[PDB]
Design an enzyme around this catalytic site. Structure first.
Site, short mmCIF file in Angstrom:
data_model
loop_
_atom_site.label_atom_id
_atom_site.label_comp_id
_atom_site.label_asym_id
_atom_site.label_seq_id
_atom_site.Cartn_x
_atom_site.Cartn_y
_atom_site.Cartn_z
N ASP A 2 -16.37 -5.76 6.48
CA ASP A 2 -15.06 -5.27 5.26
C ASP A 2 -14.69 -6.66 5.09
O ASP A 2 -14.96 -8.13 5.58
CB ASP A 2 -14.33 -4.41 5.95
CG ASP A 2 -14.90 -2.75 6.41
OD1 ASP A 2 -15.83 -2.54 4.62
OD2 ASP A 2 -14.32 -2.12 6.29
C1 LIG Z 1 3.25 -13.13 16.33
C2 LIG Z 1 3.38 -11.40 15.87
C3 LIG Z 1 2.73 -11.41 14.30
C4 LIG Z 1 3.08 -10.48 13.37
C5 LIG Z 1 2.27 -9.35 12.94
C6 LIG Z 1 2.91 -8.78 11.36
C7 LIG Z 1 1.96 -8.68 10.82
C8 LIG Z 1 2.33 -7.34 9.77
C9 LIG Z 1 1.30 -6.26 10.09
C10 LIG Z 1 1.20 -4.79 8.93
C11 LIG Z 1 1.41 -5.39 7.50
C12 LIG Z 1 0.30 -4.29 6.98
O1 LIG Z 1 -0.06 -3.78 7.00
S1 LIG Z 1 0.39 -4.81 5.18
C13 LIG Z 1 -1.15 -3.82 4.56
C14 LIG Z 1 -0.96 -4.01 3.11
N1 LIG Z 1 -1.82 -2.38 2.79
C15 LIG Z 1 -2.79 -1.80 1.43
O2 LIG Z 1 -3.11 -3.11 1.62
C16 LIG Z 1 -3.09 -0.61 1.29
C17 LIG Z 1 -4.89 -1.54 0.36
N2 LIG Z 1 -5.83 -1.80 1.11
C18 LIG Z 1 -6.67 -2.19 0.44
O3 LIG Z 1 -6.41 -2.66 -0.78
C19 LIG Z 1 -7.72 -3.10 0.65
O4 LIG Z 1 -8.39 -1.62 2.28
C20 LIG Z 1 -7.77 -4.43 1.82
C21 LIG Z 1 -6.75 -3.40 3.10
C22 LIG Z 1 -6.82 -5.44 1.37
C23 LIG Z 1 -8.88 -4.51 3.12
O5 LIG Z 1 -10.23 -4.65 1.41
P1 LIG Z 1 -11.43 -4.12 2.30
O6 LIG Z 1 -11.42 -2.78 2.01
O7 LIG Z 1 -12.42 -4.26 1.46
O8 LIG Z 1 -11.54 -4.20 3.92
#
Ligand SMILES: CCCCCCCCCCCC(=O)SCCNC(=O)CCNC(=O)[C@H](O)C(C)(C)COP(=O)(O)O
Ligand SMILES: CCCCCCCCCCCCCCCCCC(=O)OC[C@H](COP(=O)([O-])OCC(O)COP(=O)([O-])OC[C@@H](COC(=O)CCCCCCCCCCCCCCCCC)OC(=O)CCCCCCCCCCCCCCCCC)OC(=O)CCCCCCCCCCCCCCCCC
Ligand SMILES: CCCCCCCCCCCCCCCCCC(=O)O[C@@H](COC(=O)CCCCCCCCCCCCCCC)COP(=O)(O)OCC[N+](C)(C)C
Ligand SMILES: CCCCCCCCCCCCCCCCCC(=O)O[C@@H](COC(=O)CCCCCCCCCCCCCCC)COP(=O)(O)OCC[N+](C)(C)C
Ligand SMILES: CCCCCCCCCCCCCCCCCC(=O)O[C@@H](COC(=O)CCCCCCCCCCCCCCC)COP(=O)(O)OCC[N+](C)(C)C
Ligand SMILES: CCCCCCCCCCCCCCCCCCCC(=O)O[C@H](COC(=O)CCCCCCCCCCCCCC)COP(=O)(O)OCCN
Ligand SMILES: CCCCCCCCCCCCCCCCCCCC(=O)O[C@H](COC(=O)CCCCCCCCCCCCCC)COP(=O)(O)OCCN
Ligand SMILES: CCCCCCCCCCCCCCCCCCCC(=O)O[C@H](COC(=O)CCCCCCCCCCCCCC)COP(=O)(O)OCCN
Lengths: 33, 536, 83, 120, 438, 97, 57, 127, 83
Positions: I39
């Site tokens: 992925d």
């Molecule tokens: C040191 C401390 C570290 C800090 C960490 C903080 C980080 C924050 C983490 C939480 C933020 C999130 O979840 S950000 C999550 C945002 N949500 C989405 O984007 C929903 C739509 N998802 C998609 O379009 C795809 O599934 C995709 C995922 C792009 C992949 O593509 P593939 O299907 O091809 O793998």
């Protein structure tokens, strides 16, 4: 690595001029400048 | 005989830096260490004659170095008990570093120039220490300043290194300006520059503040500590010399040589510096930076002890000379670790097969830093902590500083040895020759001799304190060590970030002081002389 | 202060000068610190083991003097009515 | 978030968030042993919201994660020494060829070297 | 004295009779012979004669020449630095201009008559107007600046000299006269205010140094700025002391303001010659203020610090001229990697820059210590003000050194044998004075 | 690029020089080249050592002439072997030795 | 798990508790010590019959 | 390998330069830097000056709490349970001269007031 | 040191195996990550793991351009600091 012949007290590996002092080229036959 | 050591160091500097083409890289690798070994014999003779047998000597090289009307100063050397001790410590450490640089700097282009800088650097330290009058001290002070400028900025193709050298130069300039003011005050109202006639029982506060402001520069105290952390850009042999003896100790030596300091200022500044240095060393992730912040903390202890008692000057000097040893060992072992792992970050260090000597030297130096009982550092630090009980505010801050020191020292030890290997699967190696072993043997001999000979005459003199008060520093150090081994979280992420930025002293300078400096420059030039006063 | 009078000063001025004892160390304990100083500088590296009797005696007299200081403190404090 | 991160497409933006988060896990750790569980936790944090299709909620998650990654930027990034921001970057940079060296400089018109005052 | 004056008159004389192909060699020999005559003048100057070592008159008050402590130091300094100027300059026109300038300047130092001092010193007015405004590498604006500034200040000085000659009947220094008038005191003062670059009359010096040739810059910095202190010790302090003591708060205001604003203006420079020229302006203020205290320490310290400046700033100007010959650039931003590319030039450059920052093993240290001691004798705050703001010099010097030191460069620009011969005497003199042979 | 004729007069890369590192061999520096190791270095080091010891002898004479001890040492000091101006030692009690 | 291979005792709950208890006791004692130690230094003399007969009974 | 490592060269200037471009330090290697780091551009840890000031505002009261009690709240009689070191009269008189001495706090002494006024001495020389 | 393609291929194939989803025969010197079954979030982990394997720092914009087994090998071969 290490020393060139493995001995610290060996003759230097560099023969010639390390650089050109004042930018001047040594004369071929040893003629004074 | 007394002159010989300075001659040997300056001869090494001239020979390596001006005739190094003829001598060669090997020629430096002999003439440097041999000359400093001879200087070590001379310094040992001086130490036996002056300290143990109480025989001070004055050597006047020439008279009327500056002779303008009443103003008269001469080039003279007085080896008093303080000077002999500092001379011995400095020459011992510098001989060790010169042995170290033979293998460490072989991969560097100008090894001869590096050796020449190191030897003139030691020579100017000995000129500062042994001067009989204030002007010789100023000569040595500025000599060590310029030598630090030429050594920190050794890597000229790195913008960070040259900017670090500029930082050191500017901060030290401000400090010696204050010292020159105090020197002029003392000449005007005492009649001389010599320390003998320098004595004043009552001095106006302005002279004391000027002396303290000048001293806090080289002995990096608060608001003047910015340069020490950035001084990591230079090669490892430079860091060992500057943090162990030459630069940091000079302010403490000046404060001890002339007891014009005020108890209230020195204790508060020292305790604040110790606490802040420990807190900053908590956040740091470079191996070399943690040891610099620890140097800051130890300087804070030494400055604080002056306020406590009459023996505070002796205790400060004893901690100074004890600290030089294990701190120099810590830098040299850290530098060898960086070379072997090709890395500067504590995360990627780990357990790996190595030399028993280097690991033992690191362990023993860190134990001296922590306060492990029956060690040279332990006695010199308990002499400060136990005698600081009378100053309640100072004592509390120093005890918390001991806790923090134990924590980051144990964390560094666990990360370097106990932790699993953290670096990558690549061929990395630094094979150590017998010369580096002789270096670490010299440091270990200094550490061992410190236990038997002691640091101060009143080191084991009783401080009439309850047992639970007297043995408290050990418990605080043990608790800090145990918490450091577990790698627990002590502060919230906001305060950890605050400490990682070193309190934001540099960001304040950037945003306000430097901008005002260059706006004053803009008004002076663009608006006025190339503006209002320039024709069309 | 008056209730707890100073002890007799065994060490004299010429002896303290001959031992090169700083003025800070001239505190009714000076004779014992002369002993400790001469023995410490006599044994440069074994003084910790050899020079223990002299150090003990100095620490003992210093303890007595410290008790006198605390007694003076208590007497002065009770005179002022703080206790 | 910087302008370059904002201009990126959604797929690459979430990829950037994951990469920066992993690097900041490396920076804030004390050793490699801490890294693996925290890396799995970040894995699960991204996997939890991958199937959301509501654009507005996804924008909220991306913005909040970007703020979190901005706040937890380490004061001291762990960078390999030979790369930009590294200790050994530029210590002795390899010197290039084709250098303009003037041989025997003082013997080019030796008598007449100097500045002249030309007048009309 | 007589031998020195005769040789000073002989140097311009020789150029008229030389072959025009032997001019450089004859000029160099004449310069060295004048240096030797100056050494002879020092030999025949007995310290037993405390007021004036030597006085000679050739038939009139105007022809009265004499040497004192300040005059002897400044004359030896100019005679020392002239040969370096001679070798740096090529062409009969340039040699003629520089020889005439040096003859006039060196006659001014030993003159004891204010009107003769004015006549000899301003004789070199067009010569700099032509020199700084030379065809290709000169700027007319700078020549106009220097010429107009000198003319106005010298005319004020001349008016004061006329008033003194009318009132006293004499204007020679050897005749003791005192005046309390402020108009005459200002008339004498304005020349010093302009010639020693003191804010806001310092604008001429930068433009002149940048657009003057290296020999011209060396002379300008080396001795023409020092002519102010000869005028102050010889023609202002003996007669105008009441006015300097009356105006001392104003004098300190102007001097310390010049120091501070010149230091700040130096920070905004991108041209190496301009950096050195502004360092000179900041350095002049301590000299002017130390002399103005009218104390034994101040006068000696000012003359010493003048000698230190006349050994350090000519070296920096010479090194910059050499670098400009090698690179055809003076912008600091173009020049990088000079440490690796020019190790021999870099060593001397760093040595002289350390000298300009007044480090202990340099004459500037001893001179500054004496001057600061004089200021401290007047008041503590006076010395404290100067000592603190000295840190501004460190900032710009360090920034320049850091910019030049490292980087990437594809040109070997290092000095030749001629260049090293040019600075060797200055380095030796700097060392000898630094160890205390001031 | 075909190396210039003067390259023959210039010296080679030393053993300590890394094979990858390139430096311009024409540049002259008083402290030495990039990795040095000249031929005849052993004799130069011997000469330097001789000069060092001769200067040490001169400095030793000067210092001994100018070394002033105005207070008697507490015990015997090594300087008594070579300098005759050392005051006779007096101990802490005050007895002369 | 901080140090599994070398020193596994650090991960033990008992080690964490002992270390934290030592930290708390040492740090808080550092503050309260001044009052305490000053009290014992006073009490040593005040209840010594030779120095102060009145307080002793 | 310390020597011979690859480096990136900074691109040549291709646009009109700002007037205050002297604030940027570039030696030719790619990562050029401000003259003083933190004056402009990226901030280490993304922490502004306001954040650091707030952190210091939190710290200072806790750090100053130990010092303020002894220096201000406490008094010489109640600072310590003992009097300063007692000396013979000849030694005590000399030691009391030092303004930075430790015998100036002896409240048992009958010269306490004068000793305290000596300790709080002159700020600047009168002459 | 310019590292040859054959070794770089072996080490990139070695790294790619550790993903559980990827079947040990699907990985070929020329195969895109999609056919392997990786992925986008997985490609992040693979690019990072390549960073530990060859001891290099991939600047991020190039990290986006790595989507295949082939171009990753090409990028590693291009790098002169790759170990
Ligand atoms: C040191 C401390 C570290 C800090 C960490 C903080 C980080 C924050 C983490 C939480 C933020 C999130 O979840 S950000 C999550 C945002 N949500 C989405 O984007 C929903 C739509 N998802 C998609 O379009 C795809 O599934 C995709 C995922 C792009 C992949 O593509 P593939 O299907 O091809 O793998
Ligand atoms: C300190 C405080 C801060 C200073 C600044 C504060 C604001 C300043 C306010 C003044 C102002 O705005 O000036 C602008 C103005 C220039 O106009 P502009 O808008 O820039 O452009 C017009 C030109 O075309 C411009 O064209 P241009 O570009 O071709 O001309 C440029 C020219 C333009 O410059 C000038 O025209 C005049 C320059 C000198 C001004 C004199 C001082 C004025 C300010 C001092 C007081 C300010 C306090 C407020 O600059 C020069 O090149 C000449 C300068 C070279 C000589 C340097 C001498 C310096 C002397 C004092 C320096 C000023 C003090 C700062 C540093 C202090 C150091 C101690 O200057 C003046 O008009 C001068 C006003 C004051 C003159 C003094 C009184 C004159 C006496 C007349 C007596 C009448 C006699 C009657 C008989 C008549 C028959 C013969
Ligand atoms: C006190 C009495 C005894 C005096 C002895 C002093 C010790 C030696 C004095 C030698 C003369 C001092 C001035 C030397 C010239 C100044 C320039 C210099 O020192 O170094 C030059 C070049 O060095 C030389 O060629 C000559 C140096 C020979 C020995 C220098 C010893 C250190 C100088 C002492 C400091 C002077 C003290 C002044 C203040 C008191 C430039 O070095 P970098 O800028 O670091 O660049 C070098 C290239 N790299 C990037 C790779 C580092
Ligand atoms: C309030 C002051 C109380 C304490 C005063 C001591 C410190 C004062 C300010 C120290 C500035 C000196 C530091 C310096 O040299 O600045 C630059 C040098 O650059 C400059 O030249 C900037 C000029 C700053 C110097 C003067 C500004 C401060 C002036 C103080 C007051 C201003 C006006 C006061 C009256 C004139 C280098 O800094 P970095 O970029 O961080 O390099 C460090 C290494 N590393 C890359 C790894 C991070
Ligand atoms: C490209 C360069 C390559 C060549 C490098 C050359 C290396 C130079 C060597 C450095 C020399 C260091 C010597 C410093 C002492 C200065 C020498 C001196 O001044 O001579 C004195 C005699 O004094 C001496 O001989 C000193 C003995 C030097 C040897 C002593 C031990 C050497 C250790 C160096 C420590 C010196 C620190 C002095 C700091 C000022 C003159 O005596 P007077 O007749 O009284 O002169 C009057 C005084 N005054 C000069 C001020 C007018
Ligand atoms: C009772 C009387 C009441 C008072 C009445 C006052 C009336 C005004 C008096 C002013 C007298 C001052 C004379 C100097 C005038 C300034 C110079 C002229 C400006 C100028 O354009 O000159 C250009 C270059 O000059 C330059 O480049 C030089 C720049 C400026 C020189 C600085 C002035 C000297 C210092 C000023 C004060 C010194 C101390 C004062 C005590 C050359 O022009 P061009 O040749 O191309 O001809 C083309 C014609 N447009
Ligand atoms: C505004 C700040 C002052 C700027 C000066 C800064 C420092 C310069 C000091 C130089 C030192 C010696 C110079 C002597 C005095 C010059 C100026 C002193 C200040 C001043 O103007 O005082 C005035 C008296 O001087 C006078 O009456 C004459 C003033 C000078 C005249 C200006 C041009 C003269 C040119 C003459 C050419 C030569 C002529 C020779 C015959 C008025 O003060 P006050 O005593 O009346 O007090 C009334 C206050 N309530
Ligand atoms: C242990 C002994 C003491 C150690 C040092 C302690 C220093 C304590 C000083 C900080 C505590 C009081 C701060 C003042 C209250 C301000 C609180 C809010 C800050 C604020 O809103 O503005 C800030 C002003 O900078 C400022 O706040 C600068 C004020 C600082 C006063 C000078 C004291 C020296 C400080 C040196 C270290 C402190 C670093 C952090 C201040 C940021 O300004 P901006 O950049 O956003 O402005 C926008 C550009 N147009």
């Amino acid at each position: 690595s290490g020393h060139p012949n493995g001995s610290f007290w060996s003759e230097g590996t560099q023969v010639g001029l390390n650089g050109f002092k004042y930018g001047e080229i040594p004369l071929p036959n040893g003629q004074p400048r | 005989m007394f002159l010989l050591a300075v001659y040997f160091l300056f001869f090494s500097a001239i020979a390596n830096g001006f005739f190094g083409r003829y001598l060669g890289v090997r020629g430096s690798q002999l003439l440097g260490p041999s000359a400093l070994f001879l200087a070590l014999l001379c310094s040992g003779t001086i130490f036996y004659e002056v300290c143990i047998q109480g025989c001070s000597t004055n050597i006047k090289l020439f008279e009327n170095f500056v002779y303008s009307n009443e103003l008269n100063v001469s080039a003279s050397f007085l080896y008093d008990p303080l000077a002999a001790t500092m001379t011995l410590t400095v020459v011992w450490i510098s001989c060790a570093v010169h042995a170290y640089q033979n293998l460490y700097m072989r991969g560097d282009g100008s090894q001869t120039l590096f050796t020449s800088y190191l030897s003139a650097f030691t020579g100017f330290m000995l000129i500062l220490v042994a001067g009989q009058n204030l002007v010789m001290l100023f000569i040595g002070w500025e000599g060590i300043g310029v030598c630090s400028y030429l050594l920190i900025g050794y890597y000229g193709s790195r913008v960070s290194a040259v900017k670090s050298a500029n930082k050191s130069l500017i901060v030290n300039k401000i400090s010696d300006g204050f010292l020159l003011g105090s020197m002029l005050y003392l000449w005007f109202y005492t009649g001389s520059f010599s320390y003998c006639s320098l004595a004043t029982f009552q001095i106006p506060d302005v002279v004391s503040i000027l002396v303290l402001l000048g001293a806090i520069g080289k002995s990096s105290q608060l608001f003047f500590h910015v340069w020490l952390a950035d001084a990591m850009e230079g090669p490892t042999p430079v860091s060992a010399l500057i943090h162990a003896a030459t630069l940091v100790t000079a302010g403490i030596y000046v404060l001890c040589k002339l007891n014009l300091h005020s108890q209230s200022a020195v204790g508060i500044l020292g305790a604040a510096t110790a606490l802040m240095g420990g807190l900053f060393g908590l956040a740091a992730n470079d191996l070399k930076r943690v040891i610099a912040f620890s140097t800051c903390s130890q300087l804070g202890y030494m400055m604080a002890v002056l306020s406590t008692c009459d023996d505070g000057a002796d205790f400060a000097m004893g901690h100074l000379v004890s600290h030089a040893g294990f701190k120099a060992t810590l830098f040299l072992s850290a530098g060898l670790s960086i070379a072997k792992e090709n890395n500067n970050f504590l995360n990627r260090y780990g357990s790996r097969q190595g030399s028993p000597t280097l690991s033992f030297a690191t362990t023993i130096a860190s134990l001296n830093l922590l306060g492990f009982p029956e060690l040279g550092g332990f006695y010199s630090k308990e002499s400060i902590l136990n005698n600081a009980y009378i100053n309640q505010g100072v004592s509390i801050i120093l005890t918390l500083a001991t806790f923090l020191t134990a924590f980051y020292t144990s964390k560094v030890l666990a990360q370097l040895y106990l932790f699993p290997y953290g670096n990558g699967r690549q061929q990395k190696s630094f094979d150590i020759d017998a010369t580096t072993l002789i270096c670490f043997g010299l440091l270990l001999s200094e550490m061992l001799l410190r236990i038997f000979t002691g640091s101060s005459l009143s080191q084991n003199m009783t401080t009439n304190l309850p047992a639970h008060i007297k043995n408290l520093p050990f418990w605080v150090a043990l608790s800090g060590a145990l918490s450091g081994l577990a790698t627990t979280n002590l502060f919230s992420s906001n305060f950890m970030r605050f400490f990682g930025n070193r309190g934001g002293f540099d960001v304040f300078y950037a945003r306000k002081c430097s901008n005002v400096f260059y706006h004053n420059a803009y008004v002076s030039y663009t608006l006025l002389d190339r503006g209002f006063l320039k024709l069309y | 202060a008056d209730r707890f009078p100073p002890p007799k000063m065994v060490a004299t001025q010429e002896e303290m000068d001959n031992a090169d004892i700083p003025y800070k160390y001239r505190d009714y304990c000076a004779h014992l610190i002369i002993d400790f100083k001469e023995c410490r500088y006599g044994h440069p590296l074994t003084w910790r083991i050899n020079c223990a009797h002299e150090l003990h005696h100095y620490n003992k007299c210093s303890y007595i003097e410290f008790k006198r200081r605390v007694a003076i403190a208590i007497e002065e404090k009770k005179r002022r009515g703080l206790m | 978030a910087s302008e370059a991160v904002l201009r990126l497409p959604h797929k690459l933006r979430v990829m950037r968030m994951y990469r920066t988060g992993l690097k900041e896990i490396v920076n804030w750790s004390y050793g490699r042993h801490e890294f693996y569980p925290r890396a799995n936790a970040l894995r699960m944090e991204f996997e939890a919201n991958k199937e959301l299709s509501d654009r507005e909620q996804i924008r909220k998650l991306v913005l909040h994660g970007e703020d979190l990654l901005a706040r937890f930027r380490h004061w001291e990034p762990t960078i390999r020494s030979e790369f930009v921001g590294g200790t050994v970057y530029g210590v002795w940079p390899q010197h290039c060829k084709d250098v303009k060296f003037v041989p025997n400089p003082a013997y080019i018109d030796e008598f007449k070297q100097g500045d002249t005052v030309l007048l009309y | 004295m007589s031998l020195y004056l005769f040789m000073l008159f002989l140097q311009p004389l020789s150029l008229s009779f030389v072959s025009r192909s032997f001019s450089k060699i004859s000029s160099l020999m004449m310069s060295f012979a004048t240096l030797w005559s100056a050494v002879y003048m020092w030999f025949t100057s007995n310290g037993a004669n405390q007021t004036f070592y030597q006085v000679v008159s050739w038939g009139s008050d105007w022809s009265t020449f004499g040497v004192c402590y300040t005059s002897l130091y400044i004359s030896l300094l100019c005679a020392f630095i002239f040969p370096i100027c001679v070798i740096l300059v090529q062409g009969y026109r340039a040699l003629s201009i520089l020889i005439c300038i040096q003859t006039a300047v060196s006659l001014s130092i030993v003159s004891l008559h204010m009107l003769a001092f004015y006549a000899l010193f301003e004789s070199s007015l067009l010569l700099f107007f032509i020199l700084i405004g030379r065809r290709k590498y000169g700027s007319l604006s700078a020549a106009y600046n220097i010429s107009i500034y000198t003319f106005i200040s010298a005319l004020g000085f001349l008016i004061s000299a006329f008033w003194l000659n009318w009132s006293f009947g004499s204007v020679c220094a050897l005749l003791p006269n005192e005046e309390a008038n402020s108009f005459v005191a200002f008339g004498i003062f304005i020349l010093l205010w302009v010639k020693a670059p003191l804010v806001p009359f310092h604008l001429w010096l930068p433009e002149a140094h940048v657009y003057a040739p290296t020999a011209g810059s060396v002379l300008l910095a080396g001795v023409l700025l020092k002519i102010s202190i000869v005028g102050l010790h010889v023609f202002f302090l003996p007669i105008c002391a009441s006015s300097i003591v009356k105006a001392f708060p104003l004098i300190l205001s102007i001097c310390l303001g010049s120091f501070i604003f010149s230091s700040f203006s130096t920070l905004k420079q991108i041209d190496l010659k301009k950096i050195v020229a502004y360092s000179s302006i900041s350095h002049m203020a301590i000299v002017f203020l130390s002399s103005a205290t009218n104390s034994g320490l101040g006068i000696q310290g000012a003359v010493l610090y003048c000698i230190a400046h006349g050994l350090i700033s000519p070296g920096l100007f010479l090194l910059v001229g050499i670098l400009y010959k090698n690179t055809n650039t003076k912008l600091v931003f173009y020049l990088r990697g000079l440490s690796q590319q020019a190790p021999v030039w870099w060593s001397v450059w760093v040595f002289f820059m350390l000298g300009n920052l007044a480090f202990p093993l340099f004459p500037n240290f001893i001179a500054e210590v004496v001057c600061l001691s004089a200021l401290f004798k007047n008041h503590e705050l006076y010395a404290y003000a100067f000592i603190f703001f000295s840190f501004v010099g460190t900032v710009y010097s360090s920034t320049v050194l850091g910019r030049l030191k490292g980087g990437v460069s594809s040109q070997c620009v290092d000095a030749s044998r001629l260049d090293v011969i040019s600075w060797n005497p200055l380095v030796l003199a700097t060392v000898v004075t630094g160890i205390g042979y001031m | 690029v075909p190396e210039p004729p003067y390259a023959k007069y210039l010296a080679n890369k030393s053993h300590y020089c890394p094979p990858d590192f390139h430096y311009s061999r024409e540049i002259y520096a008083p402290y030495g080249g990039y990795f040095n190791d000249p031929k005849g270095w052993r004799t130069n080091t011997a000469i330097a050592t001789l000069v060092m010891l001769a200067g040490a002898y001169a400095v030793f004479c000067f210092g001994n002439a100018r070394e002033e001890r105005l207070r008697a040492p507490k015990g015997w000091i090594p300087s008594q072997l070579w300098n005759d101006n050392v005051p006779t030692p007096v101990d802490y009690r005050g007895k002369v030795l | 798990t901080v140090m599994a291979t070398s020193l596994p005792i650090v991960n033990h709950p008992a080690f964490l508790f002992v270390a934290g208890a030592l930290t708390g006791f040492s740090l808080t004692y550092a503050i309260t010590s001044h009052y305490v130690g000053r009290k014992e230094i006073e009490n040593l003399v005040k209840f010594d019959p030779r120095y102060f007969p009145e307080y002793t009974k | 390998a310390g020597a011979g490592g690859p480096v990136k060269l900074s691109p040549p200037v291709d646009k009109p330069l700002p007037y205050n471009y002297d604030f940027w330090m570039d030696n030719g290697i790619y990562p050029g830097q401000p003259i003083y780091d933190g004056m402009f551009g990226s901030m280490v840890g993304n922490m502004s000056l306001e954040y650091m000031a707030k952190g210091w505002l939190v710290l200072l009261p806790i750090l100053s709490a130990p010092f303020v009690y002894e220096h201000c709240i406490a008094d010489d009689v109640t600072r310590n349970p003992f009097v300063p070191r007692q000396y013979p009269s000849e030694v005590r008189e000399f030691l009391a001269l030092f303004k930075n001495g430790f015998v100036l706090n002896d409240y048992s002494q009958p010269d306490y007031e004068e000793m305290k006024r000596r300790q709080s001495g002159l700020l600047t020389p009168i002459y | 040191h310019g590292l040859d393609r054959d070794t770089v291929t072996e080490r990139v194939i070695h790294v790619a195996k550790h993903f559980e989803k990827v079947d040990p025969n699907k990985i070929t010197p020329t195969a895109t990550f999609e056919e392997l079954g990786l992925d986008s979030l997985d490609t992040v982990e693979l690019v990072m793991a390549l960073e530990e394997e060859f001891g290099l720092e991939i600047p991020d914009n190039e990290a986006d351009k790595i989507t295949t087994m082939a171009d990753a090998i090409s990028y590693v071969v291009s790098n002169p600091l790759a170990k």
